[PDB]
Structure formats: structure tokens, C-alpha cells
């Protein structure tokens, strides 16, 4: 459902609000939300 | 963090002389001589280049999160 | 127990005047999103002890502060419940 | 009036009531069952 990245092995996966909060590959208990795909604008000032 | 693009006071472009400054310091040249060879006359640019701390070299030590 | 979720207009009540469209399906805003003050960044709902019976415990951004969502952390606490930390970055 | 006791609207329309309102409802139920036990046959000590 939502992309996530592991905090230890840095592997990208996805979650569907049903899986336990853990890394699929290395079983790490700390994960981060992946960066959104939307563009971001700055005024360079 | 990283070398600034321009001198804060005057505005001379000094961001392209960091690698040259380090290489000049490699051959044992004094800091004043190295600054002189980079044509940094006004002491604003001299303090811009001389007092910079390259902290980004530390930030690159940590493993990337992706 | 409570849950991190995007509150609904009908089935969920006690909606703050701040916007909710920035939240995702899991109630957590994605990093790299510009937000302003009072905007909801964490959406949490609490069941009413004995439809339209869910307290909104959403945490809004500080009204005097702006910035971009620098980082989002999701994990579990000591007892195993959900745990979210949102770090906002701005320029002074 | 409801101005006297604070009925906090912790969640929109679906709200409970203060303890005073619940106790007033209990008192009214007590008065109703007191009234309903005076025309019909019932022990006097039970009425008291
Ligand atoms: Zn992992
Ligand atoms: Zn200068």
C-alpha cells in the first residue's frame, strides 16, 4: 500500500496496514517512509 | 559544511578554488602563498577560503538510507 | 486501542479546522511535503468506550511554524504498540 | 439552564452529559416511581 525503507539494511518494500512493523528482509524494527514522488519547488533565494 | 559559492562580503566566486587550494597545500606551500597563487587579494576572500571547514567529508561517512 | 489512520468526514467526528488531505491512507504524511501552521501531520483516532464515535487525537503542526517534512519514522515502542516521529525542516 | 454546567463537546454532536444531568434523570425516575406507587395497592413501609 505505502512504500517503506528499512532503517538497517536500507531495503525498500511496501506495507498494507496489516503487516507487523518490521523489515521484510533483515527483520529490523525501525523503518522510514519513502520520499513522495510529487515535485517540490524552491525559489533559490 | 561545503565551500561557499561566493565571498560573503564582496561576492567573488570562490567555490571553484577549493580543490586547487588543497592541492597547493599538498606540496607544502604556505597558506598565504597558496592564497596568493589563487589571486585572492582582498582579505574577505582570504578569510572565506582559509577559515572554511569541510564538514561534508564527515557526513559522507555514514551509510546512505537508500 | 487507537490507530494511525486518515479520519473520515462522516464516520469520524471532532474534525479540526486544519486540512487533512496531506495525510496518506495510514495517517502519516510523506516526507518532502510543504505544509503550513495548524496542518495535520499525524492522524490518530480513539474508539469511544461504551460510526460517528471516534475521537480525533490528531496532532497538528505548530501554528507559528512552517517547513517541509524532512523525515518520517515508524516503529514499535517497548510494549509493541505503534510509534511515529515526524521531523520537520525549515530555513531561518 | 445548560449554561450552568459545562457540557463539553469533546466530539461534535455525539456527546454524553454531565454527572448533574444523569443524577437529575435518576431523581426524575425516582419521582416517577414514587408517584406511580400511591394510587395502587402497595405496602406503606415500601412506599416510605
Ligand atoms: Zn532491513
Ligand atoms: Zn571577497
Range of the domain at B29: 1-66
Q: Is B44 annotated as a binding residue?
A: yes
**Cβ–Cβ contacts within 10 Å for residue B15, how many?**
14
Nearest chain D residue (CA) to C49 = D16
The residues, ordered by sequence, that sit 6+ positions from B15 with a Cβ below 8 Å of its Cβ are B3, B4, B5, B6
Breaks (C-N over 2.5 A) in chain A follow: none
CATH of A1-45, one of 1.10.357.10, 2.20.28.30, 2.40.70.10, 3.40.50.720: 2.20.28.30
Expt. technique: cryo-EM
Number of domains chain B contains? 1
Nearest chain C residue (CA) to D10 = C14
d(CA C66, CA C89): 8
CATH at residue B46: 1.10.10.60
Contacts of B65 in chain A (CB under 8 A): 5, 7, 10, 32
Domain residue ranges in chain A: 1-45
Chains C and D lie in contact, requiring 3 or more CB pairs less than 8 Å apart: yes
d(CA A23, CA B34): 51
DSSP state of A34: P
Amino acid at each position: 500500500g505505502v512504500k517503506y525503507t528499512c532503517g538497517a539494511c536500507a531495503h525498500n518494500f511496501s506495507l498494507n496496514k496489516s503487516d507487523p512493523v518490521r523489515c521484510k528482509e533483515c527483520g529490523h524494527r525501525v523503518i522510514y517512509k519513502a520520499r513522495t514522488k510529487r515535485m517540490i519547488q524552491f525559489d533559490a533565494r | 559544511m561545503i565551500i561557499p559559492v561566493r565571498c560573503f562580503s564582496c561576492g567573488k566566486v570562490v567555490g571553484d578554488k577549493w580543490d586547487a587550494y588543497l592541492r597547493l597545500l599538498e606540496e607544502g606551500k604556505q597558506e598565504g602563498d597558496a592564497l596568493d597563487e589563487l589571486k585572492l587579494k582582498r582579505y574577505c576572500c582570504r578569510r572565506m577560503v582559509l577559515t572554511h571547514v569541510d564538514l561534508i567529508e564527515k557526513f559522507l561517512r555514514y551509510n546512505p538510507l537508500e | 486501542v487507537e490507530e494511525f489512520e486518515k479520519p473520515t468526514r462522516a464516520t469520524t467526528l471532532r474534525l479540526k479546522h486544519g486540512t487533512y488531505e496531506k495525510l496518506d491512507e495510514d495517517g502519516l504524511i510523506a516526507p518532502g511535503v510543504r505544509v503550513s501552521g495548524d496542518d495535520i501531520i499525524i492522524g490518530k483516532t480513539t474508539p469511544i468506550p461504551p460510526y460517528h464515535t471516534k475521537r480525533d487525537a490528531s496532532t497538528p503542526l505548530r501554528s507559528t511554524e512552517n517547513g517541509i517534512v524532512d523525515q518520517v519514522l515508524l516503529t514499535t515502542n517497548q510494549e509493541g504498540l505503534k510509534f511515529v516521529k515526524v521531523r520537520m525542516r525549515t530555513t531561518k | 439552564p445548560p449554561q450552568v454546567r459545562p457540557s463539553i463537546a469533546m466530539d461534535e454532536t455525539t456527546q454524553g452529559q454531565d454527572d448533574l444531568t444523569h443524577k437529575l434523570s435518576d431523581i426524575l425516575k425516582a419521582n416517577i416511581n414514587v408517584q406511580k406507587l400511591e394510587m395502587d395497592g402497595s405496602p406503606q413501609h415500601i412506599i416510605n
